[PDB]
Amino acid sequence: HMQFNDILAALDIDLAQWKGNALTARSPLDGATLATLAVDTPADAERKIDAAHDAFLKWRTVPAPVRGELVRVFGNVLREHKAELGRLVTLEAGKITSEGLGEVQEMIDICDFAVGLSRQLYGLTIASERPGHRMMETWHPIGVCGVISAFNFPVAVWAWNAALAFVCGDSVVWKPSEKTPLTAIACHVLLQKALREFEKTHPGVAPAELGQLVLGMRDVGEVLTASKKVPVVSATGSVRMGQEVAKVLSQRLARGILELGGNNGMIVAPSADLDLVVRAVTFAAVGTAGQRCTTLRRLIVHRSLVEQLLPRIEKAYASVKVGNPLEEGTLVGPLVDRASFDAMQKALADAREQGGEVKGGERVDVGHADAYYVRPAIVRMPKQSAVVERETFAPILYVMVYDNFDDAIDVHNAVPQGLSSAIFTNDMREAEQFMSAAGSDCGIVNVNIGTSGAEIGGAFGGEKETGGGRESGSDAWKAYMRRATNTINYSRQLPLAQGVKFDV
Amino acid sequence: HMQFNDILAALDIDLAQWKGNALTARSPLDGATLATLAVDTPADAERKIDAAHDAFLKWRTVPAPVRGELVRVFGNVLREHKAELGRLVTLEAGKITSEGLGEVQEMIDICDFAVGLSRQLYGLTIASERPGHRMMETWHPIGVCGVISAFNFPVAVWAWNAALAFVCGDSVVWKPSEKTPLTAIACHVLLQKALREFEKTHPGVAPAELGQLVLGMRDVGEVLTASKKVPVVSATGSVRMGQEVAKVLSQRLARGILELGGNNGMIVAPSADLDLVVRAVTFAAVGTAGQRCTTLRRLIVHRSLVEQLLPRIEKAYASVKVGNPLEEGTLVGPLVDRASFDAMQKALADAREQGGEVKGGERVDVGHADAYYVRPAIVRMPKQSAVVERETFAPILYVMVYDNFDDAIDVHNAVPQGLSSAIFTNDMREAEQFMSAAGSDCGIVNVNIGTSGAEIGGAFGGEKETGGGRESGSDAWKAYMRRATNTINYSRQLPLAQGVKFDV
Numbered sequence A, B: 001h002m003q004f005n006d007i008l009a010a011l012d013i014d015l016a017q018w019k020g021n022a023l024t025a026r027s028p029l030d031g032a033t034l035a036t037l038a039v040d041t042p043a044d045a046e047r048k049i050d051a052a053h054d055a056f057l058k059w060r061t062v063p064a065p066v067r068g069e070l071v072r073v074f075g076n077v078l079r080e081h082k083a084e085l086g087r088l089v090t091l092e093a094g095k096i097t098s099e100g101l102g103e104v105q106e107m108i109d110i111c112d113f114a115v116g117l118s119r120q121l122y123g124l125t126i127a128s129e130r131p132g133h134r135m136m137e138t139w140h141p142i143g144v145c146g147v148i149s150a151f152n153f154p155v156a157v158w159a160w161n162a163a164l165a166f167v168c169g170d171s172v173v174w175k176p177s178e179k180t181p182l183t184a185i186a187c188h189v190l191l192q193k194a195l196r197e198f199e200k201t202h203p204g205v206a207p208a209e210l211g212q213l214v215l216g217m218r219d220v221g222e223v224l225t226a227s228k229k230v231p232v233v234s235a236t237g238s239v240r241m242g243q244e245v246a247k248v249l250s251q252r253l254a255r256g257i258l259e260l261g262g263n264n265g266m267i268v269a270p271s272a273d274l275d276l277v278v279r280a281v282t283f284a285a286v287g288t289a290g291q292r293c294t295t296l297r298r299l300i301v302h303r304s305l306v307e308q309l310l311p312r313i314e315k316a317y318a319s320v321k322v323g324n325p326l327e328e329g330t331l332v333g334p335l336v337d338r339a340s341f342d343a344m345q346k347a348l349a350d351a352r353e354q355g356g357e358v359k360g361g362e363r364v365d366v367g368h369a370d371a372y373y374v375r376p377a378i379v380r381m382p383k384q385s386a387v388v389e390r391e392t393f394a395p396i397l398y399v400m401v402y403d404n405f406d407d408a409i410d411v412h413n414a415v416p417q418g419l420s421s422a423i424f425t426n427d428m429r430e431a432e433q434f435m436s437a438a439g440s441d442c443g444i445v446n447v448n449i450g451t452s453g454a455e456i457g458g459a460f461g462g463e464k465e466t467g468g469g470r471e472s473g474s475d476a477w478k479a480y481m482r483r484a485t486n487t488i489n490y491s492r493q494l495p496l497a498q499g500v501k502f503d504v
């Protein structure tokens, strides 16, 4: 049990430098104010973008393996402060202590992955059709990387973008969610510590302005997306946010990494391991109070399994501990705020109007009118009606029955989102069909592991309204750089004159 | 010498099936009407998009090597009709006979390249951190591929997109420039011939509606870009077109391959091979009457070379034959239309107001008031002023002097476009600096080969206002498919209960 001021002190955060009376930093745990903060003006945001661009001009000529060493040092700083940073994630995002720790560990893991990439950043050498010419494809730092992040992963989304961007020779301007500024301040402070350690061993190499933190409301978010000095913006959030950002990027022909909403489903086929299913369903649907973008929200269960499987899931649901995420034993912490609670209860009301039968979903009183805890809900639906197609960012699992596998695929694919997906089956034919071109239409398509089944090494992102961006693994790093095709003529041969007078 | 009706007959085009009184197909050679055509209504366009989507649903499960066989057959059909199709390109786009032939040969070359890709389409198998799990990245046909193309490469741009899209399991809906419909009709007719040959050896495999041709004005172009059944649109044209298309794509969170304008420059450094430079400059600047998107428009010449080099370029310029592109000896055919001529003369007027000294640029009378031939212009400019930053799609080469190499790079990079670029030097240090992160900012960056130096095997496209899309070589094919990250759990191990009641 570390108090809030102990956390700040252990992170070496001096709140006096960030205090103000513009932005209230609230804890979902009890609704209490953690601190009140100053915010950037639009002009402040522009100035920070100018400084990040100057930083980029220096950083882009630093050898990438040297750039990776800063990221390696940053990984070690995060390791040293993992417990306190994780606790801050719990206080501000409301997730249980182990998920706070787990989210910081994701930051650390991507640092080490990016260190590996810092010795790669592979283009190609390519055969040329021209005699005495050589051809290659090279990759180059692109410029300032804007990062717009959501409340629910307040540190790992930024780390995923910044580790890659720094290794790729970019500076970063970060505008975190106005709901989670304190975790962002902490990350920024820990980065400054990394830069100080790196400056000891690499004097003059890293620009002090490499990472920028912009705190505030829509006005500074709009400065960032409209800035002609920011050639790529990674934007994580709602579908509506992504549409608006993409419109601004398009107007100035800039690049987007769009990581928008999910509405993730699982098909449970007749041969599924039910002992495995009941656990995988429960944990993916109720984890983080249904506030992961990969949260399981749709369950498509074969008719032969309903009578066996559903009472087991209901039994697990009822035994899940909802409570303050600081307590040992808690599995489900609070929803982030009232708007989230209201949208949940509205979704459930819609579900009932649409023929659904709701279990769970009621509010859990913890003694605070401005803290919103709920029992996870599981809703038997006669079809995948309008409410099921909405992403309600809350623990609601809609259950639909299917008979024919092709029909289950169609139902699975019929929502407008396309982030993650899973099939539980032991039949290799169904598993492969689900992963095939006519199967799941999502960016993440898993077999016998739930919809949060993803790791550093894989490209992370989705299709359809999820926006098409990819982060983290595979060659996602290319989105932080610009491709060049180079043809080099080392021949002394002159082109044919074609009757043109070239003689001296 | 093949007459127009001979060309149609040899291509097996029955004009009676395409004739109408909506769209006039005009030849830039003499301004004459070649034919008057029917056009698609918005509803026609929607119906064709529906048919292409149905075609996609069938084609996406055809093995890619089988899909490549259709493209191989298409390549052979193009070989058989190369002379006549090339002649049609000359009549409609106005380029000289060898460039008409050369453009069709690009279609043929990309077919064979796509045949190779049809046995690849590589994703990854990737280590997983989870015991008893396997992870991989797979690629899948994405859906209908919209293709919007420009007048000046009326057949190769479509071929570049369609060869890859077909091999990648996509259908194609093509809306060619309203300025070059007849070349598009020919390509579509030749594709139908390929489908008939393929149907003999592969009965029932390829959907008849795999390729669609949409002829008409903005109204059908806007149906295509707004269609929710078209997940990717490849758009080749002006910067303004690309901005408008990208806005529509963004609103529905769809993917763009944007191939917009260039404003391509060459740095000539003190050690350059001047015999080589004078030829490379002349051919890249005046070729196709300055109507390539890679046309050389800006020359940044070291002061020590000006007195030697510029009279040699002027001498070559004056000897260039401007005339009807059907004539042997012609190097420079006509501008496409009056609007192009007027914009050229306006640019030259602006250049003079901005201190420039113009040579060439006057109209060449060929006896037709509606045919626009010009002498290529070369303009000595005191600086890279406002007119030089505009892309004027005409043969105007602006010449700026430089002293310091870093300053030349800044001037080279100061325009808003970013397609292709070149440095002519024998100094390896300058050549590498130009290709480095702080060098040319373009998508194509060449050494001792001009700004049209590109080939099938390289990714083709640019940065900045050029829009960021890539076509043809390297892994450009990924833009026609959707990535999936697959994690497969084949372990029998249950997750920890975490105190949740899972027992039966």
Ligand SMILES: NC(=O)c1ccc[n+]([C@@H]2O[C@H](COP(=O)([O-])OP(=O)(O)OC[C@H]3O[C@@H](n4cnc5c(N)ncnc54)[C@H](O)[C@@H]3O)[C@@H](O)[C@H]2O)c1
Pocket (backbone or CB within 6 Å): A148, A149, A150, A151, A152, A153, A175, A176, A177, A178, A217, A218, A221, A222, A225, A236, A237, A238, A239, A241, A244, A245, A258, A259, A260, A261, A262, A292, A293, A294, A391, A393, A419, A461, A466
């Ligand atoms: N795809 C992913 O990787 C991923 C990861 C985490 C969360 N999410 C999604 O995020 C959502 C939950 O996060 P949220 O509630 O914070 O979303 P949100 O859209 O309300 O806000 C996300 C961020 O965008 C900013 N923003 C909003 N509108 C903006 C605009 N027009 N211009 C500039 N900035 C703007 C916000 O200030 C915030 O920083 C869910 O839909 C969830 O699925 C997706």
Ligand SMILES: NC(=O)c1ccc[n+]([C@@H]2O[C@H](COP(=O)([O-])OP(=O)(O)OC[C@H]3O[C@@H](n4cnc5c(N)ncnc54)[C@H](O)[C@@H]3O)[C@@H](O)[C@H]2O)c1
Pocket (backbone or CB within 6 Å): B148, B149, B150, B151, B152, B153, B175, B176, B177, B178, B217, B218, B221, B222, B225, B236, B237, B238, B239, B241, B244, B245, B258, B259, B260, B261, B262, B292, B293, B294, B391, B393, B419, B461, B466
């Ligand atoms: N980047 C490349 O690979 C490449 C290749 C060839 C040409 N170009 C560029 O193309 C331009 C010359 O071609 P152009 O004069 O035909 O260009 P353009 O922009 O006038 O037209 C291109 C195509 O877009 C269509 N179009 C225009 N506005 C549209 C809209 N709002 N919605 C839908 N469709 C729309 C036109 O009908 C035509 O088919 C130059 O700028 C040149 O640099 C680029």
